[PDB]
Design a protein around this ligand. Structure first.
Ligand code: K
Ligand code: K
Ligand code: K
Ligand code: K
Ligand code: K
Ligand code: K
Ligand code: K
Ligand code: K
Ligand code: K
Ligand code: K
Ligand code: K
Ligand code: K
Ligand code: K
Ligand code: MG
Ligand code: MG
Length: 1334
RNA sequence: GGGGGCCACUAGGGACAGGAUGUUUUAGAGCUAGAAAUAGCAAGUUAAAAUAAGGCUAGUCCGUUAUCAACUUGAAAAAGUGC
DNA sequence: CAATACCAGGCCTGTCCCCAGTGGTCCC
DNA sequence: CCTGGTATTG
């Protein structure tokens, strides 16, 4: 008995099928356990396992991190209160007790209900004097009088609890506070550099112009307009643009041939400015630095909207300004509405449901919703012009705690905190002694490179301690070893050398590593001249001379430089032909040039004696990012460099790690030659062996030492091995299920391993990423397209509009503008045509006026289009609006275009799976099947693991009319697996030489033709004129029959027509959050859940809507009525995720606490979600929850109706027009099928669905559109299957008629039905008649 | 076919340190006329505290991913069970 | 009970690692 | 978006 298995691995399904030699699917009798009368059942060996998507760990991580943050914010407050404890006890011995219970109702309060002062007079006085906390903050900052200790605590606690961001290093307000003064100093620097062309800046109000609430480009235009004879794209204009945050191009300003784009926010700005200064000189550095200072001042003026000389609390003063303008504008608006619109006053100021002022202050209306509600009201009235101006600048009736406060740096809150401490420490000595401690509380962060401050109970922690005691903000530097912790931060994540598994890899920017890469590339260069007989390698002397003459004087070394600066200057060749490098060398000595610029000592860099030292320095600059730790580590080399060079050195930082270790590159030595790898790279006679040749050469000891250094460690389990693969957690879940299915299937066939296993793997918020890409690309492009055409993120889900914005609103094949309102008339063309590369992504698509303008449609865009549009395309590439791959495919015509080898490769990639994840799956199955070795100790491959792409079976279905319709039922997954098995086994039987291409384990026109006509042996006639093939296809060598076109197609049709297919929905315990996160208001309802142990929801609100982890069948007695008479029951209890641990620790006590008595402990049945119950007439239900059910039946629609629906709905490449005519004629000859289909649905519904209202509405809707075209009626019949689909009921639409879901809101019936436990394939069942329990 | 280094991009997976809102109860004396239903007016911007119930290992730690048909022996781990 | 309609915690900054797809180049 | 929880209306 021989058989093969077909598998279809997806993100929510694994289809499986067992086939025989004749491509038939067996059927077996399977034992049925349980307590019903049924002892066995017939099963076809074909089915599909269904499961909910595997989820990533991201959400868990975000919630875990927010948890830690809440804990540490509490800890900060606790530190502060600990400092205040004794003196506060002297002033008011219950102040902190009133704060801690402020949330409680007065009934539950132990102290007086007014928090701050404990009596109503003082409380009311305080609030009248300080309506907002920022009033009190400013007062404590500016006043000199002794203040109440409780108010001081409240101010400092508000600052520490909401302390602002940490995006700016160093200190703030360093005289970069005034915009006028930094603008004046920029003008002074500029007029210093350009004495002949001075700028007249008198009468220019730079403060109001640059600090105005306007866009960057608008403020730039306003400022430039005040300077005659100066344009926004001039030098000064670009400097102002750089200060305002735009991305100016200083190229034309300095007549550069290269582009010099600068943005102060990019990571490359330091190196970009150093690059620019390398050309025009260093006299211009002062100018760009003055511009950076002005930028800092403008960013600060965005937050501090008040004069910084009337108060030392500009932030609190700005918040008070917000409050005062709110008060004035509210008074004005109230009066205006009283006078002009007296009937709308109650709606605006009293109705919380409306988005007026009442809903804005007391309801759920946001500032944006309020502005939208009140803008027409202001435009309708008179006197609302200033209010409207404030409204359009988003500065009307502002609150102080708002969504945009995230701009505030923590140095500002710190300035206010320090000021308060300096004022009040003159009166309270413990504030003088603890000033720096409190400052530390506010300013201390745990470094990202230290992680959780755990003590051996956190799987996330890596921090090591210098000593064993409690870590506080004030002793962190002394208790935590920041060095070892920062080192573990990187070393627990980076790879070791695969060749030497115990050796750490080198930093990516190590000097040694770049020497290695440069020599490895340079050692395979060849060259020819006239007198030479044959191309030659480069000798060691030539390589060293090229390194010292070119690679050590130029960041990049082009082939022209190699030809002219070496072969002409040294070798005196006027003509030389180079191979092994094109255009320029890919490797380079970047770090050498960085350190040469910083230290300016070439002899220091070239002296081998300093190698070690340099390797350590780069290591530091790679391993650490904190400039203080960098300084501490580099301190040991301070005697070698000047303090200025030490400063520039500690400023420079690198990222990334290599693939090879130092011991591999320059450590181990060949036994006989005594040379390292890098030594051979520098010189290896006339062989010039590179890295692979060296480590694979049997005449050297490198290979043997690599083999000896190898270790294996502990092997992972199956689950561990799958978890460590590179792939989505969803597809990994599918892979694990696939392996479990194959294990069961082997167990079903009597532990007989199959001949072949054929596997096919499916292909694999976002609008925010689209909006971000467009914003960044357009602001980098300098375009005003978003000014003239505003767009929201959701709108970018339209392909044509997304392309339009990515192309700056221009045609991509013609240099012309495109119209938005004309997008429906334009074309979306594939760069490389989809007949070769089936790529439908934005990476291979282009919006154009007409695809005709591409040139010829059989290849890449023509050369003329490339010549026209290459510069515009390069602009789009630099703005990251198109990718490097998109640009390269767009420009391939100037490189020869598509060659025939490329077309052959594309057609091959369409059929041969090359994704790594599928290789890993194939390897897993292969290593689990084949385990024995032959006489040569080579693996014995009993089971051949074949991998196919979906296109083979897709084309098979489309060519032989085995169509799929996904919406009808879930059988198409199983059918895909069956067809996979059939096609894969037949293909490898017909052409055995293809095993290397399709089986796991170890001229262009010819291969193009061959791989295009690889599937033709299935066909009877092929049109490529017309050729015909025999009825019986056999193997050419063995003579074995592989396909009988008269019999096997019938077999496939019978297999696809079988109604009995094992569809199994994986039952899963529910996990995750306890309930909806929403904190609901108090309500008289037992559905509310307490947010804390003592917070009765009827007084404090709380949560509702918990998630049931799994239900539990309980058979017990419950007390009934006032008598408490015991009454037997049988019901489902939903154990919530929050209740699960308490229930599982002791079920009987849990159930008795819920009210049940005398629980039959052995009749407690655990029922996860999707548990299957069979009722009458084959009706099945699945458990959605403890009180709801899902549809549990499949509608096995006959094959003729499936193919009719496919053809009539025009589901998919029609083919020959004569075959299209035949298909249309078949559609029109079988119109009655429509009615029959409805009938088939109806009989199913009345038997299984039981939705009388919905079914009647659907029948009426079908009888309403009987005159519609057949195509549309079929398209909507497709929608009709939502009523019968397995699973949760969903709404659907038949034409314009909407059918709402019919829900099954009671689980009472399944308590007397038959529970069914299914194995992973569903072949093994256990059936329990619940009606016998009671 | 499988594999490796380098260059240019792109894409996804994992971890850590932080920010601003939101929500919930309470505090921020509502006034007047009517016994009240209510009517007229005044006012509104802020704060505390919680932010999965909680756990013991008591850390400035852990608490939402992955994994799970049934049954036997099993403490569980796990293995075994149907031609 | 049965049907019906409404609801849902998102947003943001920074540091770092890994595998893997595309196009190239040199090798095992 | 889905789909299970919830209050309202019967
Ligand atoms: K009290
Ligand atoms: K001007
Ligand atoms: K609001
Ligand atoms: K190159
Ligand atoms: K670094
Ligand atoms: K020095
Ligand atoms: K879930
Ligand atoms: K789970
Ligand atoms: K490669
Ligand atoms: K990432
Ligand atoms: K109140
Ligand atoms: K199952
Ligand atoms: K993040
Ligand atoms: Mg907590
Ligand atoms: Mg708040």
């Amino acid at each position: 008995k021989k058989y093969s298995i077909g598998l279809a691995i997806g993100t929510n399904s694994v289809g499986w099928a067992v086939i025989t030699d004749e491509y038939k699917v067996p059927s077996k009798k399977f034992k049925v356990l349980g307590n019903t009368d049924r002892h066995s059942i017939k099963k076809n060996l074909i089915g599909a396992l269904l499961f909910d998507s595997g989820e990533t760990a991201e959400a868990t991580r975000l919630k875990r991190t927010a948890r830690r943050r809440y804990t540490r914010r509490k800890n900060r407050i606790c530190y502060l209160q600990e400092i205040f404890s004794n003196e506060m006890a002297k002033v008011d011995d219950s102040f902190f007790h009133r704060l801690e219970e402020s949330f409680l109702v007065e009934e539950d309060k132990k102290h007086e209900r007014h928090p701050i002062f404990g009596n109503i007079v003082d409380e009311v006085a305080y609030h009248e004097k300080y309506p907002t906390i920022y009033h009190l903050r400013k007062k404590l900052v500016d006043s000199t009088d002794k203040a109440d200790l409780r108010l001081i605590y409240l101010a400092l606690a508000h600052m520490i609890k909401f302390r602002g961001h940490f995006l700016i290093e160093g200190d703030l307000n360093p005289d970069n506070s005034d915009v006028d003064k930094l603008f004046i100093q920029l003008v002074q620097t500029y007029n210093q550099l350009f004495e002949e062309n001075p700028i007249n800046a008198s009468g220019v109000d730079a403060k109001a112009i640059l600090s105005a609430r306007l866009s960057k480009s608008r403020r730039l235009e306003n400022l430039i307009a005040q300077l005659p004879g100066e344009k926004k794209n001039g030098l000064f204009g670009n400097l102002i643009a750089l200060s305002l945050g735009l991305t100016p191009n200083f190229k034309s300003n300095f007549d550069l041939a290269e582009d010099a784009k600068l943005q102060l926010s990019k990571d490359t700005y330091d190196d970009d400015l150093d690059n620019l200064l390398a050309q025009i000189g260093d006299q211009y550095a002062d100018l760009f630095l003055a511009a950076k200072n002005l930028s800092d001042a403008i960013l600060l003026s965005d937050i501090l909207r008040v004069n910084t000389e009337i108060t030392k609390a500009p932030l609190s003063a700005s918040m008070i300004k917000r409050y005062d303008e709110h008060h004035q504008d509210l008074t004005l608006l109230k009066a205006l509405v009283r006078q002009q619109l007296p009937e709308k006053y109650k709606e605006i100021f009293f109705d919380q449901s409306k988005n007026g002022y009442a809903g804005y202050i007391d309801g759920g209306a946001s500032q944006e919703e309020f502005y939208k509600f009140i803008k027409p009201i202001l435009e309708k009235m008179d006197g609302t012009e200033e209010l409207l101006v404030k409204l359009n600048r988003e500065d009307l009736l502002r609150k102080q705690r708002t969504f945009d406060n995230g701009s505030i740096p923590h140095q500002i809150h710190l300035g206010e905190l320090h000021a308060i401490l300096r004022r009040q420490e003159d009166f309270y000595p413990f504030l003088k002694d603890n000033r720096e401690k409190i400052e530390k509380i506010l300013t201390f962060r745990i470094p990202y490179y230290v992680g959780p401050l755990a003590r051996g109970n956190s799987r996330f922690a890596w921090m090591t301690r210098k000593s064993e005691e409690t870590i506080t903000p004030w002793n962190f530097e002394e208790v935590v070893d920041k060095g070892a912790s920062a080192q573990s931060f990187i070393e627990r994540m980076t790879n070791f050398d695969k060749n030497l598994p115990n050796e750490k890899v080198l930093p990516k920017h190590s000097l040694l590593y770049e020497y290695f890469t440069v020599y490895n590339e340079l050692t395979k260069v060849k060259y020819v001249t006239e007198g030479m007989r044959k191309p030659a390698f480069l000798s060691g002397e030539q390589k060293k001379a090229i390194v010292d003459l070119l690679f050590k004087t130029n960041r990049k070394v082009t082939v022209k430089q190699l030809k002219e600066d070496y072969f002409k200057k040294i070798e005196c060749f006027d003509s030389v032909e180079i191979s092994g490098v094109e255009d320029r060398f890919n490797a380079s000595l970047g770090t050498y040039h960085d350190l040469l610029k910083i230290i300016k000592d070439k002899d220091f860099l070239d002296n081998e004696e300093n190698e070690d030292i340099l390797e350590d320095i780069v290591l530091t600059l790679t391993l650490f990012e904190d400039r203080e730790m960098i300084e501490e580590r580099l301190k040991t080399y301070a005697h070698l460099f000047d303090d200025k060079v030490m400063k520039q050195l500690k400023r420079r930082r690198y990222t990334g790690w290599g693939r090879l270790s130092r011991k591999l590159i320059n450590g181990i030595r060949d036994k006989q030659s005594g040379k390292t790898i890098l030594d051979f790279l520098k010189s290896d006679g006339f062989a010039n062996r590179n890295f692979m040749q060296l480590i694979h050469d049997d005449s050297l000891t490198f290979k043997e030492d690599i083999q000896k250094a190898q270790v294996s460690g502990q092997g992972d389990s199956l689950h561990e091995h799958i978890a460590n693969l590179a792939g989505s957690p969803a597809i990994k879940k599918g892979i694990l299920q696939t392996v479990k299915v194959v294990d069961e299937l082997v167990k079903v066939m009597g532990r007989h391993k199959p001949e072949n296993i054929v596997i096919e793997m499916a292909r694999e918020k976002n609008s925010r990423e689209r909006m971000k890409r467009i914003e960044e690309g357009i602001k980098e492009l300098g375009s005003q397209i978003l000014k003239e055409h505003p767009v929201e993120n959701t709108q970018l889900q339209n392909e044509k509009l997304y392309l339009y914005y990515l192309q700056n609103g221009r045609d991509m094949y013609v240099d012309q503008e495109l119209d938005i309102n004309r997008l429906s008339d334009y074309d979306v063309d594939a760069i490389v045509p989809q007949s070769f590369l089936k790529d439908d992504s934005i990476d291979n698509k282009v919006l154009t006026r007409s695809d005709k303008n591409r040139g010829k449609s059989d290849n890449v865009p023509s050369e003329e289009v490339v010549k026209k549009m290459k510069n515009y395309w390069r602009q789009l590439l630099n703005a990251k609006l198109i990718t490097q791959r998109k640009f390269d495919n767009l420009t391939k015509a100037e490189r020869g275009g598509l060659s025939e080898l490329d077309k052959a490769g594309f057609i091959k990639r369409q059929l041969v799976e090359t994704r790594q994840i599928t290789k890993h799956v194939a390897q897993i199955l292969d290593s689990r099947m084949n385990t024995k070795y032959d006489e040569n100790d080579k693996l014995i491959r009993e089971v051949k693991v074949i991998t196919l792409k979906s296109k083979l079976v897709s084309d098979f279905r489309k060519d032989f009319q085995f169509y799929k319709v996904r919406e009808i039922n879930n059988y198409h997954h199983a059918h895909d697996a069956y067809l996979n098995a059939v096609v894969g086994t037949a293909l490898i039987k017909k052409y055995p030489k293809l095993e290397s291409e399709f089986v796991y384990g170890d001229k262009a026109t010819a291969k193009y033709f061959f791989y295009s006509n690889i599937m033709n042996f299935f066909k009877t006639e092929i049109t490529l004129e017309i050729r015909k093939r025999p009825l019986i296809e056999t193997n050419g060598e063995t003579g074995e029959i592989v396909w009988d076109k008269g019999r096997d197609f019938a077999t496939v049709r019978k297999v696809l027509s079988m109604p009995q297919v094992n569809i199994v929905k994986k039952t899963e315990v529910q996990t995750g959050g306890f309930s909806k996160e929403s904190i609901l208001p108090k309500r008289n309802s037992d559905k509310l859940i307490a947010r804390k142990k003592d917070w009765d929801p009827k007084k404090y609100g709380g949560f509702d809507s918990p998630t049931v982890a799994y239900s539990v069948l309980v058979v017990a007695k419950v007390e009934k009525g006032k008598s408490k008479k015991l009454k037997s029951v049988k019901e489902l209890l939903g154990i919530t995720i929050m209740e699960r641990s308490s229930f599982e620790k002791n079920p009987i006590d849990f159930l008795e606490a819920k009210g049940y008595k005398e629980v039959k402990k052995d009749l407690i049945i655990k029922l996860p979600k999707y548990s299957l119950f069979e009722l009458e007439n084959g009706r099945k239900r699945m458990l959605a929850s403890a009180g709801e059910l899902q549809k549990g039946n499949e509608l096995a629609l006959p094959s003729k109706y499936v193919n009719f629906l496919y053809l009539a709905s025009h589901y998919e490449l029609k083919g020959s027009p004569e075959d299209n005519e035949q298909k249309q004629l078949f559609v029109e000859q079988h119109k009655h099928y429509l009615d029959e289909i409805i009938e088939q649905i109806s009989e199913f519904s009345k038997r299984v669905i039981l939705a009388d209202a919905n079914l009647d509405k659907v029948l009426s809707a079908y009888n309403k559109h009987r005159d519609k075209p057949i195509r549309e009626q079929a398209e909507n019949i497709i929608h009709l299957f939502t009523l019968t689909n397995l699973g949760a009921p969903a709404a659907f639409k038949y034409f314009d008629t909407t059918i709402d879901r019919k829900r099954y809101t009671s689980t009472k019936e399944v308590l007397d039905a038959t529970l069914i436990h299914q194995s992973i394939t569903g072949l093994y069942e256990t059936r329990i008649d619940l009606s016998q329990l009671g």
